[PDB]
Amino acid sequence: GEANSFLEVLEQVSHLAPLDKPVLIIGERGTGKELIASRLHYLSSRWQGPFISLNCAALNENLLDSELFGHERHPGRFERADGGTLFLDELATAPMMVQEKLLRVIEYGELERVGGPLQVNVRLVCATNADLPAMVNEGTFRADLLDALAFDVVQLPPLRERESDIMLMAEYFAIQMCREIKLPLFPGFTERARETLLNYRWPGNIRELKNVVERSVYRHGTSDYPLDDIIIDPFK
């Protein structure tokens, strides 16, 4: 089963999920932030409402503003998440204009409408791997938004800090790949392979571990001998 640090996350999420308070998830790529956001939704009373997601980094300023708040129609992500949960990833990339508008939605529960407003009821979950307090000091993140956004913070441990989970998950992914390519048995990892796995920093965390292990099993391609060559870098 999962490491103590990850179990402590799951326990935190079970307590946070029922609240209608905004949650901030801090974690590297491939640590499962969106999955945690989804768990907060499905363990909440809003579980039958919508779960909407948006990656702030993916859009330029003008498109981000329209995608989040709408452009009268083109309903934005807040309107689409009404009665449910909205997950905003890579929050630190949101331009200052969007951050100010986000604060207003959090505190007033309304979207502005020029002329011709919308009240919305959305539980907000955001994610980042930036140091938001540091960006506040730099002027690149709003202090007021951070004061209202981070009711509580869920910090996902990177794989490198869950060394116990690395061989567990590696074996899991290896077995699944053996099924996919019809090997009769996963023949295990050599000690050399284990050193490679446990010494590497996994900057891509769980996604990268899966990719690495699946490639390695395929390249090895046999059940007759233990897997010795962990192919971290497919470019070599």
Swiss-Prot record:
Residues 6-217 form the Sigma-54 factor interaction domain. The keyword Phosphoprotein does not apply. Coiled coil: none annotated. One of its GO terms (cellular component) is cytoplasm. It is found in: Cytoplasm. GO terms for molecular function: ATP binding; ATP hydrolysis activity; cis-regulatory region sequence-specific DNA binding; DNA binding; DNA-binding transcription activator activity; identical protein binding; sequence-specific DNA binding. GO terms for biological process: negative regulation of DNA-templated transcription; phosphorelay signal transduction system; positive regulation of DNA-templated transcription; regulation of cellular response to stress; regulation of DNA-templated transcription. ATPase activity is inhibited by interaction with PspA. Under inducing conditions, the interaction is disrupted, allowing activation of psp transcription. The keyword ATP-binding applies. It comes from the Bacteria. Keywords: Activator, ATP-binding, Cytoplasm, DNA-binding, Nucleotide-binding, Transcription, Transcription regulation, Two-component regulatory system. ATP binds at residues 27-34, 81-90. Transmembrane segments: none annotated. Forms a complex with PspA, which is composed of around 6 PspF subunits and 6 PspA subunits. Transcriptional activator for the phage shock protein (psp) operon (pspABCDE) and pspG gene. This is Psp operon transcriptional activator. It comes from Escherichia coli (strain K12). The gene is pspF.
